[PDB]
């Protein structure tokens, strides 16, 4: 048994990381087939980032201003294109190591693995969640262009590319078509994230993992209703729970013998009373970075 | 910025995972050069595990009783050997994907990444620490033979192979020469782990990471002495801090402008007063699964 925050194996993604320099700026790129993908602000200096006109800045660049390096080997660029906030460098060479892949736009509250990279080389892997306010609480040191992914069977679902640190120290980025998650733009300006609310369906699934693993102290004699739970939920900045969410927890309810609303009531009491210095699954707070699918696949 | 629990990239290890069946028992093996390494209790049934005579059980096996499968391809075994608690299956084929590697016996309190595997295929990666009592708090579902590793440059330092779950639900295993960490044996019996004490040098380094990342509330007006800290440490089941440990934190002291003993006193006050419902680096407890080297390499 046991329950750890688990990343996907990263080998299929390592073989796709390249380095992209343009001017004095260098960052990570994703080489899939004959296209390298990277943050378009690779064409910006620091002062550029204050207020960039990407079209105007990009017009001043030709194919040969982009230096794409894959390991010690070097790629030739026969075309560049801006798609939203990503630059797409068309190269002459298919990446031999291209895995099966899809581009996916995930939903707030879903999880994925990040291969943090520096100058095109892999440095680390960790598992994180897209917050409800479309930020990531990450470790991004240089790391721009690192990508997030899920892995279904033999196929890599790329869902995130890192672009920036907000003045508030959390991180924002795009899907692999270049559209930011949330209301953020690739400009060094004050931008607000909305209120960082807790992913209720994830906490519940994690409480199930707890039960599956023998941590049962938090289970209480009460029950509750969806409405009355949400009334408590919104008072604690918890995402509202819907009936789709209840449906998603179904397998976990079947395994443990505990109905979703009973668990809901145990969570209510937890929120209203605290944890009394007691831990759950070795944690002193409620964890919301496991989806129901994560718990199932792990357990 | 930001601070996440980071695993090493696992691609170099994925290409080494194979499946080893002998009788009805199947588990993970590590294929390096022309040797497959795996837990010797792959030769045991469940009832065998109650009290196995490994020599006697192994004598009843020839090379052809071992079914080593690497992906969909199949290896031929031209020799088997018991080295302590690991079986070493000599095969006819060098693993083409063999990275540069070393076998290392790590020390209590050091950290490494685990590629949890099932039937020879990679399922996940996470970062963990060898506890002071030589157990691992892991997620081992089937996972026997999964290995732990660090990665220095281009070279994989293999340091751990999983063998068993203790009745207490924590995990024990061996180095890659077959010697268990701790006093555990590969037998399904009651075995005790000693008291699980906290890795003091790791907590301190994590408090430095906190400071580096702007979490500073816990810094106090006090200071203390090594002896008087250890007096507090041993009362809270914290590993004694030595002068080697103080020396290891040196770079972190240089970066932050905070001397080790001042941080020691902030940690004292934390231990004696609690956290007052306040978090550090997004955690409500003191984390001891980052070494000083981890903090440095990340930060």
Coordinates of C-alpha atoms in Angstrom, one line a residue:
Chain A
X1 CA 0.0 0.0 0.0
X2 CA 1.0 3.6 0.5
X3 CA 0.1 6.9 -1.2
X4 CA 2.6 9.2 -2.8
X5 CA 2.2 12.2 -5.2
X6 CA 3.2 10.4 -8.4
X7 CA 4.5 11.8 -11.7
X8 CA 4.2 10.1 -15.0
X9 CA 7.5 8.5 -16.3
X10 CA 9.2 11.2 -18.3
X11 CA 11.3 9.3 -20.8
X12 CA 8.9 9.8 -23.7
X13 CA 9.1 13.6 -23.0
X14 CA 12.8 13.9 -22.4
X15 CA 13.6 12.8 -26.0
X16 CA 11.5 15.8 -27.2
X17 CA 13.2 18.6 -25.2
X18 CA 15.4 21.0 -27.3
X19 CA 17.0 24.4 -26.7
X20 CA 15.7 27.5 -28.7
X21 CA 17.9 30.6 -28.8
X22 CA 16.9 33.8 -30.6
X23 CA 19.0 36.8 -29.9
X24 CA 20.3 36.7 -26.3
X25 CA 17.3 34.7 -25.0
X26 CA 17.3 30.9 -24.7
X27 CA 14.6 28.6 -23.5
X28 CA 13.1 25.2 -23.8
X29 CA 11.3 23.8 -26.9
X30 CA 9.3 20.8 -27.7
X31 CA 10.4 18.9 -30.9
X32 CA 7.5 16.8 -32.3
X33 CA 7.7 15.5 -35.9
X34 CA 9.2 18.4 -37.9
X35 CA 8.0 21.2 -35.6
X36 CA 9.6 22.8 -32.6
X37 CA 7.2 24.5 -30.2
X38 CA 8.3 27.2 -27.8
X39 CA 7.1 30.4 -26.0
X40 CA 6.9 33.2 -28.5
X41 CA 8.5 35.6 -26.0
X42 CA 11.8 33.8 -26.8
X43 CA 12.0 36.7 -29.3
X44 CA 11.8 39.3 -26.5
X45 CA 14.5 40.9 -24.4
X46 CA 13.7 41.9 -20.8
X47 CA 12.8 45.5 -21.7
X48 CA 10.7 44.1 -24.6
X49 CA 8.6 42.1 -22.1
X50 CA 7.5 45.3 -20.4
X51 CA 5.1 46.0 -23.4
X52 CA 5.8 43.8 -26.5
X53 CA 4.2 44.1 -29.9
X54 CA 4.7 40.4 -30.8
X55 CA 3.8 40.8 -34.5
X56 CA 6.1 43.8 -34.9
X57 CA 8.9 42.1 -33.0
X58 CA 8.5 38.9 -35.0
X59 CA 8.5 40.6 -38.3
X60 CA 12.2 41.6 -37.6
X61 CA 13.1 37.8 -37.4
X62 CA 13.8 35.4 -40.2
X63 CA 14.2 31.6 -40.1
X64 CA 17.9 31.9 -39.5
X65 CA 17.6 34.1 -36.3
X66 CA 16.3 31.0 -34.5
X67 CA 18.9 28.7 -33.1
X68 CA 17.3 25.3 -32.3
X69 CA 19.6 22.8 -30.6
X70 CA 18.6 19.2 -29.8
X71 CA 21.3 17.9 -27.5
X72 CA 24.6 18.5 -29.1
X73 CA 23.0 18.3 -32.6
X74 CA 21.6 21.4 -34.4
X75 CA 18.3 21.8 -36.4
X76 CA 17.7 23.8 -39.5
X77 CA 14.6 26.1 -39.5
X78 CA 12.7 26.3 -42.7
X79 CA 9.7 28.3 -41.4
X80 CA 8.4 30.1 -38.4
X81 CA 4.9 30.9 -37.4
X82 CA 3.1 32.5 -34.5
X83 CA 0.1 30.6 -33.3
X84 CA -1.4 32.6 -30.4
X85 CA 1.3 32.8 -27.8
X86 CA 3.4 29.9 -29.1
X87 CA 6.0 30.1 -31.8
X88 CA 6.1 27.1 -34.2
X89 CA 9.5 26.5 -35.8
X90 CA 9.2 24.2 -38.7
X91 CA 12.5 22.2 -39.1
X92 CA 13.8 19.9 -41.8
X93 CA 14.0 16.9 -39.5
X94 CA 11.4 14.7 -37.9
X95 CA 12.3 14.1 -34.3
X96 CA 13.1 10.3 -34.4
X97 CA 12.0 10.0 -30.8
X98 CA 8.5 11.5 -31.4
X99 CA 6.1 9.5 -29.3
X100 CA 2.4 9.2 -30.0
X101 CA 1.0 12.4 -28.8
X102 CA -2.1 14.6 -28.6
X103 CA -2.5 18.3 -27.7
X104 CA -5.2 18.6 -25.0
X105 CA -6.6 21.6 -23.2
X106 CA -7.3 20.4 -19.7
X107 CA -9.8 21.7 -17.2
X108 CA -9.3 23.6 -14.0
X109 CA -8.6 21.1 -11.2
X110 CA -7.1 18.5 -13.5
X111 CA -3.5 17.2 -12.9
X112 CA -0.5 16.6 -15.0
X113 CA 3.3 16.0 -14.8
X114 CA 5.9 18.7 -15.5
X115 CA 9.4 18.0 -16.8
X116 CA 11.2 21.1 -15.5
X117 CA 14.1 21.7 -18.0
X118 CA 17.0 24.2 -18.2
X119 CA 18.5 25.1 -21.5
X120 CA 16.8 22.1 -23.1
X121 CA 18.0 19.5 -20.7
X122 CA 15.8 17.6 -18.3
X123 CA 16.2 18.6 -14.6
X124 CA 13.3 17.2 -12.8
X125 CA 9.7 15.8 -12.9
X126 CA 6.8 16.5 -10.5
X127 CA 3.0 16.3 -10.5
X128 CA 0.9 19.4 -10.1
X129 CA -2.7 20.6 -10.6
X130 CA -4.1 23.4 -12.6
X131 CA -5.6 25.6 -9.9
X132 CA -9.3 26.8 -10.2
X133 CA -7.9 30.3 -11.0
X134 CA -5.8 28.7 -13.9
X135 CA -2.4 29.1 -12.2
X136 CA 0.2 26.5 -11.2
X137 CA 2.1 26.3 -7.9
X138 CA 5.3 25.2 -9.4
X139 CA 9.1 25.3 -9.4
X140 CA 10.1 27.3 -12.5
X141 CA 13.7 28.6 -12.2
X142 CA 15.2 29.4 -17.6
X143 CA 12.4 26.8 -17.3
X144 CA 10.2 28.6 -19.8
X145 CA 9.0 26.2 -22.4
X146 CA 9.0 23.2 -20.1
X147 CA 5.8 21.3 -20.7
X148 CA 3.1 19.5 -18.7
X149 CA 1.7 16.1 -19.8
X150 CA -0.4 13.1 -19.0
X151 CA 0.4 9.7 -20.4
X152 CA -2.4 7.3 -21.5
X153 CA -1.0 3.9 -22.5
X154 CA 1.7 4.7 -25.1
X155 CA 0.5 8.2 -26.0
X156 CA 1.6 11.5 -24.5
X157 CA -1.2 14.1 -24.0
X158 CA 0.6 17.4 -23.9
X159 CA -1.5 19.9 -22.0
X160 CA 0.7 22.8 -20.7
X161 CA 3.7 24.9 -21.6
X162 CA 5.2 27.3 -19.0
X163 CA 5.5 30.9 -20.0
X164 CA 5.8 33.1 -16.9
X165 CA 6.0 33.9 -13.2
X166 CA 3.4 36.4 -12.1
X167 CA 4.5 39.1 -9.6
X168 CA 2.7 37.0 -7.0
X169 CA 5.2 34.2 -7.5
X170 CA 2.7 31.7 -9.0
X171 CA 3.0 30.5 -12.6
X172 CA 1.0 30.8 -15.8
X173 CA 1.2 29.4 -19.3
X174 CA -0.6 28.0 -22.3
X175 CA -1.9 24.9 -23.9
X176 CA 0.1 23.6 -26.9
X177 CA -2.0 25.7 -29.3
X178 CA -0.8 28.8 -27.5
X179 CA -3.9 29.9 -25.6
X180 CA -3.1 30.9 -22.0
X181 CA -4.9 29.2 -19.2
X182 CA -6.8 32.0 -17.4
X183 CA -6.8 35.6 -18.2
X184 CA -3.0 36.0 -18.4
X185 CA -0.9 37.5 -21.2
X186 CA 2.8 37.2 -22.0
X187 CA 3.7 40.6 -20.8
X188 CA 5.7 41.7 -17.7
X189 CA 2.9 43.6 -16.0
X190 CA 0.8 43.4 -12.9
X191 CA -1.8 40.7 -13.5
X192 CA -4.1 39.4 -10.9
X193 CA -5.1 35.8 -10.3
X194 CA -8.6 35.4 -9.0
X195 CA -9.2 33.8 -5.6
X196 CA -7.3 30.5 -5.3
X197 CA -10.1 28.1 -4.3
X198 CA -9.8 24.5 -3.2
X199 CA -10.7 21.7 -5.7
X200 CA -13.4 20.0 -3.7
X201 CA -13.7 16.9 -5.8
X202 CA -10.0 16.2 -5.4
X203 CA -10.0 16.5 -1.6
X204 CA -12.9 14.0 -1.4
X205 CA -11.0 11.5 -3.6
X206 CA -8.0 11.9 -1.4
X207 CA -10.1 11.2 1.7
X208 CA -11.1 8.0 -0.1
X209 CA -7.5 7.2 -0.7
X210 CA -7.0 7.7 3.0
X211 CA -9.7 5.2 3.9
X212 CA -8.3 2.7 1.3
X213 CA -5.0 3.0 3.2
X214 CA -6.4 2.7 6.7
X215 CA -6.5 6.3 7.8
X216 CA -10.1 6.4 9.1
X217 CA -10.2 8.7 12.2
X218 CA -11.9 11.5 10.3
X219 CA -15.0 9.5 9.4
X220 CA -17.9 10.8 11.5
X221 CA -21.4 9.8 12.5
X222 CA -23.0 12.6 10.4
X223 CA -24.2 13.0 6.9
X224 CA -25.4 16.0 4.8
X225 CA -26.9 17.3 1.6
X226 CA -25.3 18.6 -1.5
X227 CA -26.8 22.1 -1.0
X228 CA -25.9 22.3 2.7
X229 CA -22.4 21.0 1.9
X230 CA -21.9 23.7 -0.8
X231 CA -23.2 26.3 1.7
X232 CA -20.3 25.2 3.9
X233 CA -18.0 24.8 0.9
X234 CA -18.3 28.3 -0.4
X235 CA -17.8 29.7 3.1
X236 CA -14.3 28.0 3.1
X237 CA -13.5 29.0 -0.6
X238 CA -14.1 25.4 -1.8
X239 CA -15.2 24.8 -5.3
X240 CA -18.9 24.0 -5.5
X241 CA -19.6 20.2 -5.8
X242 CA -21.8 19.2 -8.7
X243 CA -23.6 16.0 -9.5
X244 CA -21.0 15.3 -12.2
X245 CA -18.4 15.4 -9.4
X246 CA -20.5 13.0 -7.3
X247 CA -20.7 10.7 -10.3
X248 CA -16.9 10.8 -10.7
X249 CA -16.3 9.6 -7.1
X250 CA -18.6 6.5 -7.7
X251 CA -15.9 3.9 -8.0
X252 CA -14.3 5.2 -4.8
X253 CA -17.6 5.0 -3.1
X254 CA -18.1 1.4 -4.3
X255 CA -14.7 0.3 -3.1
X256 CA -14.9 1.8 0.4
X257 CA -18.5 1.3 1.2
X258 CA -18.9 5.0 2.0
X259 CA -21.4 7.2 0.1
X260 CA -20.3 10.5 -1.3
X261 CA -22.5 12.6 1.0
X262 CA -21.3 10.8 4.1
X263 CA -17.7 11.6 3.1
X264 CA -19.0 15.1 2.4
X265 CA -20.2 15.4 6.0
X266 CA -16.9 14.1 7.4
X267 CA -15.2 16.8 5.2
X268 CA -17.7 19.5 6.6
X269 CA -16.7 18.6 10.2
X270 CA -13.1 18.7 9.2
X271 CA -13.5 22.2 7.7
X272 CA -15.5 23.5 10.7
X273 CA -13.5 21.9 13.4
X274 CA -10.0 21.7 12.0
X275 CA -7.7 18.7 12.3
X276 CA -6.9 19.0 16.0
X277 CA -3.2 18.5 15.3
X278 CA -3.9 15.1 13.7
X279 CA -2.7 14.2 10.2
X280 CA -4.4 12.4 7.2
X281 CA -2.1 10.3 4.9
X282 CA 0.9 11.9 6.6
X283 CA -0.4 15.5 5.8
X284 CA -1.6 18.1 8.2
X285 CA -3.9 19.8 5.6
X286 CA -6.4 18.7 3.1
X287 CA -4.7 17.8 -0.3
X288 CA -6.5 18.8 -3.5
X289 CA -3.9 17.8 -6.1
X290 CA -5.1 14.2 -6.6
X291 CA -8.0 13.7 -9.0
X292 CA -10.4 10.8 -8.6
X293 CA -8.6 9.2 -11.6
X294 CA -5.2 9.6 -9.9
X295 CA -6.4 7.8 -6.7
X296 CA -7.9 5.0 -8.8
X297 CA -4.9 4.5 -11.0
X298 CA -2.6 4.6 -8.0
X299 CA -4.7 2.5 -5.5
Chain B
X1 CA 10.8 30.5 -8.0
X2 CA 8.7 27.9 -6.2
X3 CA 9.6 24.7 -4.3
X4 CA 8.2 21.2 -5.3
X5 CA 9.3 17.7 -4.3
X6 CA 11.2 16.8 -7.4
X7 CA 12.0 13.4 -8.9
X8 CA 14.9 12.7 -11.3
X9 CA 13.9 12.2 -14.9
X10 CA 13.3 8.5 -15.3
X11 CA 14.0 7.8 -19.0
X12 CA 17.4 6.4 -18.3
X13 CA 15.8 3.9 -15.9
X14 CA 12.7 3.0 -17.9
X15 CA 14.8 1.5 -20.6
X16 CA 16.2 -0.9 -18.0
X17 CA 13.0 -2.3 -16.5
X18 CA 12.2 -5.9 -17.4
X19 CA 9.7 -8.6 -16.2
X20 CA 11.0 -11.7 -14.3
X21 CA 8.7 -14.7 -13.9
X22 CA 9.7 -17.9 -12.1
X23 CA 6.9 -20.3 -11.4
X24 CA 3.7 -18.4 -10.7
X25 CA 5.5 -15.3 -9.3
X26 CA 6.3 -12.3 -11.5
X27 CA 8.1 -9.1 -10.5
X28 CA 10.3 -6.3 -11.9
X29 CA 13.9 -6.7 -12.8
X30 CA 16.8 -4.3 -13.7
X31 CA 18.6 -5.2 -17.0
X32 CA 22.1 -3.7 -17.0
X33 CA 24.7 -4.9 -19.5
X34 CA 24.2 -8.7 -19.6
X35 CA 22.8 -9.1 -16.1
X36 CA 19.2 -8.9 -14.9
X37 CA 18.8 -8.1 -11.2
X38 CA 15.7 -8.9 -9.2
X39 CA 14.5 -9.8 -5.7
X40 CA 15.4 -13.4 -4.9
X41 CA 12.0 -14.1 -3.5
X42 CA 10.8 -14.2 -7.1
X43 CA 11.4 -17.9 -6.5
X44 CA 9.0 -18.1 -3.6
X45 CA 5.3 -18.8 -3.5
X46 CA 3.2 -17.1 -0.7
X47 CA 3.5 -20.0 1.6
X48 CA 7.2 -20.1 0.9
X49 CA 7.6 -16.6 2.2
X50 CA 6.4 -17.6 5.6
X51 CA 9.8 -19.3 6.2
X52 CA 12.0 -19.7 3.1
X53 CA 15.3 -21.6 2.8
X54 CA 16.5 -19.6 -0.2
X55 CA 19.5 -21.9 -0.9
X56 CA 17.3 -25.0 -0.8
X57 CA 14.6 -23.3 -2.9
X58 CA 17.1 -22.0 -5.4
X59 CA 18.8 -25.4 -5.9
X60 CA 15.5 -26.6 -7.4
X61 CA 15.7 -24.0 -10.2
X62 CA 17.8 -24.1 -13.4
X63 CA 18.5 -21.3 -15.8
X64 CA 15.4 -22.1 -17.9
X65 CA 12.9 -21.8 -14.9
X66 CA 13.5 -18.0 -15.1
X67 CA 11.4 -16.1 -17.7
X68 CA 12.9 -12.7 -18.3
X69 CA 10.9 -10.5 -20.6
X70 CA 12.0 -7.0 -21.7
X71 CA 9.0 -5.3 -23.3
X72 CA 7.6 -7.8 -25.8
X73 CA 11.1 -9.3 -26.4
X74 CA 12.4 -12.3 -24.4
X75 CA 15.9 -12.9 -22.9
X76 CA 17.8 -16.1 -22.7
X77 CA 19.3 -16.9 -19.2
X78 CA 22.7 -18.5 -19.3
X79 CA 23.4 -18.4 -15.5
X80 CA 21.8 -17.5 -12.2
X81 CA 23.4 -16.6 -9.0
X82 CA 22.3 -15.5 -5.5
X83 CA 24.1 -12.5 -4.1
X84 CA 22.7 -11.8 -0.6
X85 CA 19.0 -11.1 -1.2
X86 CA 19.2 -10.3 -4.9
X87 CA 19.2 -12.8 -7.7
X88 CA 21.5 -12.1 -10.7
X89 CA 20.3 -13.6 -14.0
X90 CA 23.1 -13.6 -16.5
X91 CA 21.6 -13.2 -20.0
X92 CA 23.1 -13.5 -23.5
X93 CA 22.3 -9.9 -24.4
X94 CA 23.7 -6.6 -23.3
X95 CA 20.8 -4.2 -22.7
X96 CA 21.5 -1.7 -25.6
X97 CA 19.9 1.0 -23.4
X98 CA 22.3 0.5 -20.5
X99 CA 23.1 4.0 -19.2
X100 CA 26.3 4.8 -17.3
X101 CA 25.6 3.6 -13.8
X102 CA 27.0 2.8 -10.4
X103 CA 25.7 0.8 -7.5
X104 CA 25.7 2.9 -4.3
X105 CA 24.7 2.2 -0.7
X106 CA 23.2 5.4 0.5
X107 CA 22.9 6.6 4.1
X108 CA 19.9 7.0 6.4
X109 CA 18.3 10.4 5.6
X110 CA 19.5 10.6 2.0
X111 CA 16.9 10.9 -0.9
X112 CA 16.4 9.2 -4.2
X113 CA 13.7 8.7 -6.9
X114 CA 11.7 5.5 -7.3
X115 CA 10.3 4.4 -10.6
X116 CA 7.3 2.3 -9.4
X117 CA 6.7 -0.4 -12.0
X118 CA 4.2 -3.2 -12.5
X119 CA 5.0 -6.4 -14.4
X120 CA 8.1 -4.6 -15.9
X121 CA 6.3 -1.6 -17.1
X122 CA 6.9 1.9 -15.7
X123 CA 3.9 3.3 -13.8
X124 CA 5.2 6.3 -11.9
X125 CA 8.0 8.3 -10.4
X126 CA 8.3 10.0 -7.0
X127 CA 11.0 11.2 -4.7
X128 CA 11.5 9.7 -1.2
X129 CA 13.9 9.5 1.6
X130 CA 15.5 6.6 3.4
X131 CA 14.1 7.0 6.9
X132 CA 16.6 6.9 9.9
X133 CA 15.1 3.5 10.7
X134 CA 15.9 2.3 7.2
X135 CA 12.3 2.1 5.9
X136 CA 10.7 4.0 3.0
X137 CA 7.2 5.5 3.2
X138 CA 6.3 4.6 -0.3
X139 CA 3.5 3.5 -2.7
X140 CA 4.3 -0.1 -3.6
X141 CA 1.3 -2.0 -5.0
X142 CA 3.5 -6.2 -7.9
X143 CA 6.0 -3.3 -7.5
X144 CA 8.7 -5.6 -6.1
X145 CA 11.9 -5.1 -8.0
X146 CA 11.3 -1.4 -8.7
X147 CA 14.5 0.5 -8.0
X148 CA 15.5 3.8 -6.5
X149 CA 18.2 6.0 -8.1
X150 CA 19.9 9.3 -8.1
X151 CA 21.3 10.8 -11.4
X152 CA 24.6 12.7 -11.4
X153 CA 25.2 14.2 -14.9
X154 CA 24.8 11.3 -17.4
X155 CA 25.3 8.5 -14.8
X156 CA 22.6 6.6 -12.9
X157 CA 23.5 5.8 -9.3
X158 CA 21.2 2.9 -8.4
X159 CA 20.7 2.8 -4.6
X160 CA 17.6 0.8 -3.8
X161 CA 15.5 -2.2 -4.8
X162 CA 12.1 -2.7 -3.2
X163 CA 11.5 -6.1 -1.7
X164 CA 8.7 -6.0 0.9
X165 CA 5.9 -4.4 2.9
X166 CA 6.2 -4.8 6.6
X167 CA 3.1 -5.7 8.6
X168 CA 3.2 -2.0 9.7
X169 CA 2.6 -0.9 6.1
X170 CA 6.0 0.7 5.5
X171 CA 8.5 -0.7 3.0
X172 CA 11.9 -2.3 3.1
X173 CA 14.5 -3.4 0.5
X174 CA 18.1 -3.7 -0.5
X175 CA 21.0 -2.0 -2.2
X176 CA 21.8 -3.4 -5.6
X177 CA 24.3 -5.9 -4.0
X178 CA 21.4 -7.4 -2.1
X179 CA 22.1 -6.2 1.4
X180 CA 18.9 -5.0 3.1
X181 CA 18.7 -1.5 4.5
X182 CA 18.1 -1.9 8.2
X183 CA 17.6 -5.2 10.1
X184 CA 15.0 -6.6 7.8
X185 CA 14.9 -10.0 6.1
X186 CA 13.0 -11.2 3.1
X187 CA 10.6 -13.3 5.1
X188 CA 6.9 -12.8 5.8
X189 CA 7.2 -12.5 9.5
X190 CA 6.6 -9.8 12.2
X191 CA 9.6 -7.5 12.0
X192 CA 9.9 -4.2 13.9
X193 CA 11.2 -1.0 12.6
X194 CA 12.8 1.1 15.2
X195 CA 11.5 4.5 16.2
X196 CA 10.9 6.7 13.0
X197 CA 12.9 9.8 13.9
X198 CA 12.9 13.1 12.0
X199 CA 15.9 13.9 9.8
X200 CA 17.0 17.2 11.4
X201 CA 19.5 18.3 8.8
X202 CA 16.8 18.0 6.1
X203 CA 14.2 20.1 8.0
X204 CA 16.8 22.8 8.4
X205 CA 17.7 22.8 4.7
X206 CA 14.0 23.0 3.9
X207 CA 13.6 26.0 6.3
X208 CA 16.4 27.6 4.2
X209 CA 14.5 26.9 1.0
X210 CA 11.5 28.6 2.7
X211 CA 13.6 31.7 3.3
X212 CA 15.0 31.6 -0.2
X213 CA 11.3 31.6 -1.4
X214 CA 10.1 34.4 0.8
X215 CA 8.4 32.4 3.6
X216 CA 10.0 34.1 6.6
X217 CA 7.5 34.3 9.4
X218 CA 9.1 31.5 11.4
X219 CA 12.4 33.4 11.8
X220 CA 12.7 34.4 15.5
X221 CA 14.8 36.8 17.6
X222 CA 16.5 33.9 19.5
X223 CA 19.6 31.8 18.9
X224 CA 20.9 28.6 20.6
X225 CA 23.7 26.1 21.0
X226 CA 24.2 22.8 19.3
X227 CA 24.0 20.9 22.7
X228 CA 20.9 22.8 23.8
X229 CA 19.3 22.3 20.4
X230 CA 20.0 18.5 20.5
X231 CA 18.6 18.4 24.0
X232 CA 15.4 19.8 22.5
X233 CA 15.9 17.7 19.4
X234 CA 16.0 14.3 21.2
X235 CA 12.9 15.3 23.2
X236 CA 11.0 15.5 19.9
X237 CA 12.5 12.4 18.3
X238 CA 14.7 14.5 16.0
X239 CA 18.0 13.1 14.8
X240 CA 21.0 14.6 16.6
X241 CA 22.7 17.4 14.6
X242 CA 26.4 17.0 14.2
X243 CA 29.1 19.4 13.1
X244 CA 29.3 17.6 9.7
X245 CA 25.6 18.5 9.4
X246 CA 26.3 22.1 10.2
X247 CA 29.0 22.1 7.6
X248 CA 26.6 20.7 5.0
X249 CA 24.2 23.6 5.5
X250 CA 27.0 26.1 4.8
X251 CA 26.1 27.2 1.3
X252 CA 22.5 27.7 2.4
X253 CA 23.8 29.8 5.3
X254 CA 25.9 31.9 2.9
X255 CA 23.0 32.5 0.5
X256 CA 20.4 33.6 3.1
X257 CA 22.5 35.4 5.6
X258 CA 21.2 33.3 8.5
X259 CA 23.7 31.2 10.6
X260 CA 22.9 27.6 11.2
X261 CA 22.4 28.1 15.0
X262 CA 20.0 30.9 14.5
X263 CA 17.9 28.7 12.2
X264 CA 18.3 26.0 14.8
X265 CA 16.7 28.3 17.4
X266 CA 13.8 29.2 15.0
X267 CA 13.3 25.4 14.6
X268 CA 13.4 25.0 18.4
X269 CA 10.6 27.5 18.9
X270 CA 8.7 25.8 16.1
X271 CA 9.0 22.5 17.9
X272 CA 8.1 23.8 21.3
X273 CA 5.3 26.2 20.2
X274 CA 3.8 24.5 17.1
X275 CA 2.9 26.2 13.9
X276 CA -0.2 28.1 15.2
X277 CA -2.2 27.0 12.1
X278 CA 0.3 28.7 9.9
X279 CA 2.0 26.9 7.0
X280 CA 5.6 27.0 5.6
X281 CA 6.2 26.5 1.9
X282 CA 2.5 25.4 1.6
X283 CA 2.9 22.7 4.3
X284 CA 1.5 22.5 7.8
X285 CA 4.3 20.3 9.1
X286 CA 8.1 20.3 9.0
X287 CA 9.3 18.4 5.9
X288 CA 12.4 16.3 6.2
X289 CA 12.5 14.7 2.7
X290 CA 14.8 17.3 1.1
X291 CA 18.5 17.1 1.7
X292 CA 20.7 20.2 1.6
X293 CA 21.9 19.0 -1.8
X294 CA 18.3 18.8 -3.1
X295 CA 17.5 22.4 -1.9
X296 CA 20.7 23.7 -3.6
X297 CA 20.2 21.8 -6.9
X298 CA 16.6 23.0 -7.0
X299 CA 17.0 26.6 -5.7

